[PDB]
C-alpha cells in the first residue's frame, strides 16, 4: 500500500496502478464487508461546505468500517485544523475555497486530509465512484467508447475523470457541448501528446449506436426516446442531481444508472479511508 | 413476524395483533437490553422538518440496538430517497409535507421507511408510544376509561389512538372540547358501527372520579387542584410540548405521567426497528 | 470514586484529590486507551450554545470510550432536560444562560449533568485540561511561577484556574493586564487569606525569565521576539481561540502549547465522562 497516511487532494495526484488497487479494495469491500476494519478509530466529517449527500456517504463509508464520526455539516482555518488534528486519526473535509485542503494538510500533522470537495475544484472521490461504476459495469477501464454531454467547461470533475481514463488504453471520447462550453484545451492536448481519440459532437444520436458509457453533467436534455440504437452494454452517469438534463422517464431503463453510481460512492470512500488508515489488506 | 422489512407509514395500516406484538417487543426490550440486535446496520435520520425530541428518541432508539446513525436534522425528494436508499439499511424521516413517507417508500426500493412525521398527518410512534404507555400502566389495554381533553378536531394522532384502542373491547371514552374543536363525526361513527360507549364533556371534573387515562392535547387548562377526586391507578397523558395546557403543580402528583410518556417513546421505537430489520426475536 | 454519578456544575465545588485522581485518570486513558469502558452508554451533547471545537473534543472523548452520543449542536429547558434525561445515561450540555446547567440537575433525575460552558460562567473542563497540561508540561502542579497575561476581569476560566493552582502549595503568580481588565479583588482576597505570592506587571518581559507558565486570555500582543530569555521549560498556553494576542511566528517555537493545550481536552474530558458513569477503574 502506497496510500497508507497519504493526504488524498487531488485525483491527479495517482498513478495508474493506485487506482486499481482502490478498485480492487472497493470491489473486495462491496463483496465481503470487513465491519472491523477501522474500528477504534475516529474520524472528522469537516463539512464546512454543506453536502449532505456526500457527507451521508462519506459517513456511512466510515460506519461500513465500524468507525465514529465527530464532525459539522456547517479563528483561521489553520488554527481549526490545528486543534482538530489533535481529536481524531483522520480529516474528511469539505470547503467552499479553493486548495483549502491542500492548506489544511499544512497543520495536519500525522493526521491525513481527504478532500470532499475544495472549492469547486479537486472532489477525487467522485471521480473514483465514476471509475469504479464504470469498471463495475464494464468489467474494464480499457478500450470502451465514453460519451461527455453538456457543460464540460467548468465542472473539473469531468477533467478528472477525462484524465483518469487516458491512464488506461485504448478509450475514444466524445465531446457533446453548446461551444461556449467545451471540454478546455490542455486535455485535449494530454490526450494528443498521449494518442488518444476523442471527437466532438453537436447532438447524442449522432453517436448513439457506439458509445459504451454516457456520462452527463450539470438545451442538451436527454430522454427515453434517444435510446433506441443503445448498445445493451450502455450505461447512463450522471454526478448529481439532475433535474431535466436526465428526464425522469429514463429512470425505468435499463441504461439508467446514476443511482447505482452514487450508491457506489460508499465503496469507493470504504475503500480510500480502508487504504489510508490501514496497512494490510 | 408480519413486520419484517415493512415499511410503516400509517399505524392505521396495522392489526391489533401487529399492535401486542410490538408492544411485547417493546417491553422485552425494556426488560432485557439486546444492545447488539441490529448491529452493523446503518439508519438513516432524515429530519426534513426539525424535530429534536422526536429526533433524539428516534436515534437513541437506534443506538440501543448498537445501530449507527447517518442524517440530517434540517433536485426532488424522489432522487433524494433513490439515492439514499443506497446507502442505509432503513430510512427514518420526517416531513413537513403531506404523503411525503407514502412517496418516499415508492424509491426506496428493498429499504423500509419509517415515517417520524409526515406533515401533521401521521406519527404512528407517538401513538404507539401512547398505546405501549396505557398497557404499561393500567397493565391492559382492555376495559379502560379514557378522557381526551382540549384540540380533538386537528392533531391526527387523536385519531390515530382512538382508532387503535377500538381495536380492543371494553372501553368508554370522554371528550371534553369546546365546540369548534371536537373529535370530527368519522371516529364517533368508527366508534357507533363497532358498539363502543362515548360521551362528550364540557369540564374535566364532570367525570373526573371514572378515568383511568386523562390524555391531553396541543382555556381547558389543567392543574393539580383538579385531581382530588382521581382514581389512584389515574394517568396524565401530553404527547408534549406542553405550556401551561398542564401547569407545572401537577408534576409534583403520582398521576403525572407525560415524562414517562416520552420516555417510553424509546421502547416503541426500539421494538418498531426490531421488528423491521431482524426476523428472529 | 467520589464522584460516580455527581453532576458537575462548577470546578470550584472539587476538592484538590479530587483534580489530582481527574488527571490521573487522563493520564492513564492518555497512556494505554479503554475503547470499551463506556460501552452500551449513550450521551446526549446539548449545545443549546453553538461550540463546536468544545462540542467536538466532548464528543471525541464519549467516542474514545465506546460510548455512543446523540444531541444538536443548535417548551421551557425544564420540560427540555426532564424528557432528555428519560433517554441518556448523561447529558452533557452547553446553554447561553447562567445558571442553566444548575438548573437542568434539578429535573435531570439519576442522569449526571456535565457543564460544558453556561452562559459565559463555569467551563470546568477547560481548566481541568489546562490543569492537566500544566501538570503534563512540568510534571507537577507545585511550586510554579504563572504568569497570567490578558484581560483577567471577565473570563471566568481565570478565575477557576488560579483557584484550583491555589489549592496546590508554592506557586507564585504574575498578573499582566491594563488596568480596566485586572484579577478581580475576591481572588487577590483568596491568595492573601491563603498565604500565595503574587504580582501585578505591565509588561511581559518585566518576568519573562521567571515564569514556567504563560497564560494568556481573550496591546498586549505576544511575538516570539519576547521569548528570548525564557526557561527551557517554559509553555504557552491559551485556551483558544487566538487571533493576534499569539502572533504566528511563536507556533514554531518549542514553548508554543496552546495546540497540544487544547487536544488534551480529550483526556480530561474522557477521564470525567469515565469517573461519572463509571465506578471501578
Known sequence: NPLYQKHIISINDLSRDDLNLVLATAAK???????????????????????????????????????????????????????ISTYVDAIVMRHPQEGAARLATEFSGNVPVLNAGDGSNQHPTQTLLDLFTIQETQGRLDNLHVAMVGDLKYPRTVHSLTQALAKFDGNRFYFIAPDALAMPQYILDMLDEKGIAWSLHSSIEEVMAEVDILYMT??????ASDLHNAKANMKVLHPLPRVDEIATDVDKTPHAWYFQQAGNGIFARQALLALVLNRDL
Open 29 to 83: 469491500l462491496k463483496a465481503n464487508p470487513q465491519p472491523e476494519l477501522l474500528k477504534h478509530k475516529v474520524i472528522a466529517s469537516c463539512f464546512f461546505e454543506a453536502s449532505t449527500r456526500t457527507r451521508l456517504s462519506f459517513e456511512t463509508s466510515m460506519h461500513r468500517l465500524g468507525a465514529s464520526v465527530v464532525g459539522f455539516s456547517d479563528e483561521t482555518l489553520a488554527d481549526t485544523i490545528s486543534v
Open 218 to 223: 450539470r438545451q442538451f436534455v436527454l430522454r
